């Protein structure tokens, strides 16, 4: 399947994955990194690369990060730059993770998965009222 790597400031990426697996069962071909004060984008690029070495990236890689413009985002941006089937999507939330992981198994195309992740992430934000 398409590889997914989650990165967030601090130690939330591992827990967002754990939450998803509590809903969907353990997932394959998913990696994550943490970002600790003192580290820079270059440290993070190495961390992302070490995770990718263990993933099947033949169909592509989707980096799901916490916020636009943070170090996790900046480092992921430097990796995907001239790579086909590599994308970075900011604002990762549980609706995005769950929908994306579910669709991934039905072997969608890369563009289809990227579009679904953005759409479900946004539609997942809703007030009860």
């Amino acid at each position: 399947t398409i590889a997914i790597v989650i990165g967030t400031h601090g130690w939330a990426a591992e827990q967002l994955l754990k939450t998803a697996e509590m809903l969907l069962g353990e997932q394959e071909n998913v990696g994550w990194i943490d970002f600790v004060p003192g580290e820079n984008a270059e440290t993070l690029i190495e961390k992302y690369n070490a995770q990718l070495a263990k993933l099947d990236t033949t169909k592509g890689v989707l980096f799901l990060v916490d916020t636009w413009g943070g170090s996790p985002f900046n480092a992921a941006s430097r990796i995907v730059v001239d790579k086909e089937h590599y994308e970075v999507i900011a604002g990762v939330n549980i609706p995005m993770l769950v929908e994306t992981l579910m669709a991934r198994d039905d072997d969608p195309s890369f563009d289809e998965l990227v579009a679904l992740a953005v759409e479900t992430g946004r539609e997942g934000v809703k007030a009860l009222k």
Partner: protein, 165 residues
């Protein structure tokens, strides 16, 4: 000269505050903004906030003085109009010494502080800031002090001349 084009050099210890950056961006027709400061470059939290509030259609970058000289040494931005943001005139003289070409420097604002002399409503200078301005003027570089482009332009030397002789 056949490399990047400095659309404008604004000095401000606050970098982006209010719409000074919004209005100056549209009037200066700038689509890129580069921040030169080692103290800010060392603040990953501040960089994130500045990058997330970067005006729409405008990109904000954060680099150090050494890295900035290299970005300018790349013709990839030739013709591109970029705005330089500095926190102190000392960092401006450093870029000039690296062979950076500057025709004029604009003083946007400087947080006042004890031991410094107030030259404008919100512009303060220390014996170090004044010394840097004098060197730029000795090189034929123009020095103008103004908070907004709609306010009257004053000459840095004139303000410092009525204070420091």
């Amino acid at each position: 000269n056949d490399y990047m084009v400095i659309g404008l050099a604004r000095i401000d210890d606050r970098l982006i505050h209010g719409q000074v950056a919004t209005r100056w961006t549209k009037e200066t027709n700038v689509s890129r903004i580069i921040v030169v400061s080692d103290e800010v470059a060392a603040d990953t939290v501040r960089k994130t906030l500045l990058t997330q509030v970067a005006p729409p259609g405008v990109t904000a970058h954060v680099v150090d003085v050494a890295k900035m000289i290299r970005v300018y040494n790349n013709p990839k931005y030739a013709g591109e109009r970029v705005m330089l943001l500095f926190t102190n005139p000392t960092d401006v003289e450093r870029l000039v010494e690296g062979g950076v070409k500057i025709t004029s420097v604009n003083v946007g604002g400087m947080a006042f502080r004890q031991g410094k002399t107030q030259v404008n409503n919100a512009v303060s200078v220390d014996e170090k800031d004044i010394e840097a301005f004098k060197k730029l003027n000795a090189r034929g570089i123009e020095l103008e002090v103004r908070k907004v482009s709609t306010d009257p332009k004053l000459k840095m030397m004139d303000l410092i001349s009525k204070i420091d002789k």
